[PDB]
RNA sequence: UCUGAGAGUUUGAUCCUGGCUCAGGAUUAACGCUGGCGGCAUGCCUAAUACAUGCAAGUCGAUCGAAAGUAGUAAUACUUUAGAGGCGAACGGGUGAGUAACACGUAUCCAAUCUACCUUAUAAUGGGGGAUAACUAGUUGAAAGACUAGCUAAUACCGCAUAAGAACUUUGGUUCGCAUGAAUCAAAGUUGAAAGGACCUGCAAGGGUUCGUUAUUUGAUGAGGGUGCGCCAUAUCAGCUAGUUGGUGGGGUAACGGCCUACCAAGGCAAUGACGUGUAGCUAUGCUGAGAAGUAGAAUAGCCACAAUGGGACUGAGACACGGCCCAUACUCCUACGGGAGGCAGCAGUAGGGAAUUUUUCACAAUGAGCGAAAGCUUGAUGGAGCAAUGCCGCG
RNA sequence: UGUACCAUUUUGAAUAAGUGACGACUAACUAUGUGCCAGCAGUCGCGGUAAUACAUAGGUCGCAAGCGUUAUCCGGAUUUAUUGGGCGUAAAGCAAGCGCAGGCGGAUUGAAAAGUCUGGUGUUAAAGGCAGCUGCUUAACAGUUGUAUGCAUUGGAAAC
């Protein structure tokens, strides 16, 4: 939203950007990739969830299998 | 809100609730850690904070209580004069469910807190709804009437069986106590004073 | 009668090359707030010969408070000891 | 977005405002009268006008002492 | 015009109150000049521990009180050693 | 009587210097998963961005004329209020934009000040005059209104008589002071007040209580000024300051003061950091620390500042006035195209920004305020109830 | 507000459990799948076909109506060291000298009392801080009494 242009790196696996989408960054600092720093929380907006996770669900973003 | 598997629990750190019922129990007298990963070596030199926590556990799960409820409680006897070992001891067996258990008047000490929970229960001039009230030598605590004709009184109106620090004075339920529990009724299943200090890291 | 007090303030005389003043200097020694050690400080009152007092520069004076009489003069000098100068 | 509380103060305070400006008008015709051609027996009225406006509030109080001492001063320097 | 009154600084569905002298333009619950003693609507009896002290120095100096607050001074007594001090 | 826990990580392995990371708390928190309830408290940190709509300061007929309504044959009785007048609207509520300095905290001197109502005490509250709201009529308009001419009332306004005491000077004494200077007289000169209302008694005359008024006296509260000390970063900001420094006479301010004025001078501050830049409301305090202290100035409470932006002034004891007035700028809206209306940083709420923060709620019932004798009246302050696991605590 | 609460009032376990982790720091491990691919990660680092570090499953652990992640502040950090660090070989002694202002500084006597120490008084608003007590079923919380810190003035002490 400000004007500055970070490269952020999509931790999952899977994703469904189309080059054009809207995403919710957090923090982080990934080690292998030199000059990222943040994280893209995933399952909030147009980003969608990862599913096929039963484990550490609430950190990825996906409904209770229930 | 409490576990509903007191064997696994119990069978891990080896010591019941002082009477063994949950470990021996009818089947296949079982005395080793729990799950499929039990029967191994690597056994003894669990680090000081290994043990600790382990040691901790044992006694909030004597009594059911929540780790939270235990800072507070921790942090109220921890100042006043100085070396208050005889206060939290007194402190922590001060609870209101704890007493009933130990009155003799309930089968198991989370049954009691059904009772206490339930209106069952009177203190020594008024009545009990919360199970953590803290409570003070000298009160009468006197049973509730409504309770002593339920289906379930056999084994409540057998507390013959009593611990010392308890002057249930049946019958007439006067249900007083004094004569603060000595090291003694508090058996080796915690008996221990570096949790105190394991709390000072933790709790200021 | 009973009549509060006025504070005093002592000083040297540094300069005087206007009419009928004194640009006097005070100093004090404050505490360090961290290192606790005390610094000489210098800060210059202005006050006026009026009369009777003269005061001329290097004249050591004392300093009593007055109402101001124009701004940054609120100052009025007093007995000297030790003329000179 | 009005009260009329105050929409009928502003009415009352222009009317104030004439009667008012006439008096502090009165007492400033007077004083340069009196100082023009210097005689005691103007001073006298304006004592009388300083203080009824001195009363009234119309003037600040203090307005009035010293004006009356100062033009006391140029009599009896001039007496 | 200091005016003995009160200030709430109780917590939700408990009032607790304490006779002050304070000025009329200051807000209720903010500062005042001298404690003269607290209150309780529900403490049955001695509800107003007053202090018979400074009270009379500040309604001799003029204080004023308030349709409670004089109710108040009533039941102990405080108005009959006020008025008959004036006399 | 205070009072302190460590570990991982450079090397084939070791010791040391040294940086990084973790174990603990905490928040005005947000996001993901999940989700039952109760007792407390918190809840636009961003756009001081713009705002639909509805509420947020009125009160007194026991100040006054008139009008209207209800009863009454009438005389009149009761009720109501557009307007004149008094009082309050400067309190209370919100926000932190600006501000690096007497803004603030602390200690002070106001021989350099004010203070409406309030406290105590002390003299008066007599008698006249001229006006205008409401109303009527006319012009101009859909209306808001506006203009013109007559009619009235008073606790509105303006004279007059009168000063116990006041205020201004004069005469010499007193006691003196901290330099200017205050303090007290005795005599004199000069100047100067207002309004009645309600009720009771009395054939009347007259008398009386109470509210209110003028002139004073005591204090107190509140406001204002000056001063010592404390209170950010930066020298990869070294000169700054021409009403700036001082005197004189005068003017002005509640008061001292280049606050202002005319003249006479050339000073003042600055390496012990001026000036400039950037940043920020300050404080009591919140979190953390064994301590020294670090950190943020949630809530609430003190002080200051602000009210679309920038200026000016009236009324008043007090404003240069959040929901008063005048002017300019910007912005929006209405119109019948001539003219006007507007200020949610008051309670909700809307749009927008944001990762993100709530009822377009009820009652003055308690506390608090303003007016009133009371009846009362007004109170988005306040007290509750919604909303949200936002935090602490408790129970399932 | 028919609100808190109360009663032998009907029914009835009926209306209610999630999240992180399990190689070490750090309490808690096995199988299946994948095969330097897909992925994890606060740090060391795991994955190249026998992975207790990934995915899935079982078990287990740390919490609980909350649990993790992210952001900010403090501690740990003696890691700006007044309390409380160093400058030969690890960062750090200017190339050396003459040196004003500043800081420090021989011995003895006298006075003053600016530092220094002490007594009295005033003040440092209330809430908060700590202690005790009370009241809410105890707590959270609310109230209650106690509880310093500094500044100014005055009276003494005279070792530095
Ligand atoms: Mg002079
Ligand atoms: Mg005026
Ligand atoms: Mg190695
Ligand atoms: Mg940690
Ligand atoms: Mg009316
Ligand atoms: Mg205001
Ligand atoms: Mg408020
Ligand atoms: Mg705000
Ligand atoms: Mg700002
Ligand atoms: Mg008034
Ligand atoms: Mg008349
Ligand atoms: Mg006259
Ligand atoms: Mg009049
Ligand atoms: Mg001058
Ligand atoms: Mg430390
Ligand atoms: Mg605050
Ligand atoms: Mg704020
Ligand atoms: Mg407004
Ligand atoms: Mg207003
Ligand atoms: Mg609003
Ligand atoms: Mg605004
Ligand atoms: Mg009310
Ligand atoms: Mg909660
Ligand atoms: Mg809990
Ligand atoms: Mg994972
Ligand atoms: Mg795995
Ligand atoms: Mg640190
Ligand atoms: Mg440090
Ligand atoms: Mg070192
Ligand atoms: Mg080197
Ligand atoms: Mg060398
Ligand atoms: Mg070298
Ligand atoms: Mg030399
Ligand atoms: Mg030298
Ligand atoms: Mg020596
Ligand atoms: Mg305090
Ligand atoms: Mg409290």
């Not at chain 2, 007298?29 to 044992?58: C, D, V, W």
């Not at chain 2, 049954?111 to 203190?123: D, F, I, P, T, Y």
């Not at chain 4, 009225?45 to 009234?56: E, F, H, I, P, T």
Request: charged letters at 30%; one cysteine or more; a positive charge.
């Amino acid at each position: 939203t400000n004007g500055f242009e970070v490269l952020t790196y999509i931790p999952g696996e899977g994703h469904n950007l189309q080059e054009h989408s809207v995403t919710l960054l957090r923090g982080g600092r990934v080690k292998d990739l030199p000059g990222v720093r943040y994280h893209i929380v995933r399952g909030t907006l147009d980003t969608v969830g990862v599913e096929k996770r039963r484990q550490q669900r609430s950190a990825y973003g996906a409904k209770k299998p229930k | 809100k409490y576990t509903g598997s007191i064997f696994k629990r119990s069978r891990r750190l080896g010591f019941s609730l002082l009477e063994n019922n949950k470990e021996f129990s009818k089947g296949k007298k079982r005395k080793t850690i729990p799950g499929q990963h039990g029967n191994r070596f690597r056994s003894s030199t669990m680090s000081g904070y290994a043990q600790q926590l382990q040691e901790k556990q044992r006694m909030q799960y004597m009594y059911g209580i929540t780790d939270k409820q235990f800072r507070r409680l921790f942090r109220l006897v921890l100042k006043q004069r100085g070396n208050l070992a005889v206060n939290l001891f007194r402190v922590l067996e001060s609870r209101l469910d704890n007493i009933v258990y130990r009155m003799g008047f309930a089968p198991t000490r989370r049954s009691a807190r059904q009772l206490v929970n339930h209106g069952h229960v009177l203190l020594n001039d008024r009545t009990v709804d919360t199970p953590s009230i803290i409570l003070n030598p000298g009160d009468k605590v006197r049973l509730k009437a409504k309770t002593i004709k339920i289906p379930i009184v056999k084994a409540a109106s057998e507390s013959g069986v009593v611990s010392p620090f308890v002057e249930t004075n049946n019958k007439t339920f006067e249900g007083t106590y004094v004569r603060f529990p000595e090291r003694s009724e508090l058996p080796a299943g915690i008996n221990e004073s570096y949790v105190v200090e394991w709390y000072k890291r933790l709790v200021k | 009668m009973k009549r509060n007090q006025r504070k005093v303030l002592i000083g040297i005389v540094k300069s005087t090359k206007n009419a009928k003043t004194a640009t006097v200097q005070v100093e004090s020694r404050f505490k360090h707030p961290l290192y606790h050690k005390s610094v000489v400080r210098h800060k210059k009152y202005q006050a006026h010969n009026e009369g009777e007092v003269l005061a001329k520069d290097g004249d050591k004076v004392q300093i009593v408070e007055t109402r101001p009489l124009s701004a940054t003069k609120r100052f009025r000098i007093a007995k000297i000891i030790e003329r000179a100068k | 977005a009005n009260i009329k509380s105050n929409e009928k103060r502003l009415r009352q305070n222009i009317k104030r405002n004439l009667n008012n400006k006439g008096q502090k008008t009165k007492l400033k015709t007077n004083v340069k009268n009196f100082h023009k051609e210097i005689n005691l027996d103007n001073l006298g009225n304006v004592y009388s006008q300083a203080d009824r406006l001195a009363r009234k509030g119309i003037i600040s109080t203090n307005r009035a002492r010293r004006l009356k001492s100062r033009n006391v001063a140029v009599l009896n320097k001039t007496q | 015009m200091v005016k003995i009154r009160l200030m709430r600084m109780g917590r939700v569905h408990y009032p607790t109150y304490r006779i002050v002298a304070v000025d009329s333009r200051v807000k209720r619950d903010g500062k005042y000049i001298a404690l003269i003693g607290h209150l309780n609507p529900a403490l049955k009896e001695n509800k107003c521990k007053i202090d018979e002290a400074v009270a009379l120095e500040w309604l001799n100096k003029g204080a004023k009180p308030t349709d409670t607050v004089r109710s108040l001074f009533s039941q102990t007594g405080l108005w009959k050693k006020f008025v008959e001090s004036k006399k």
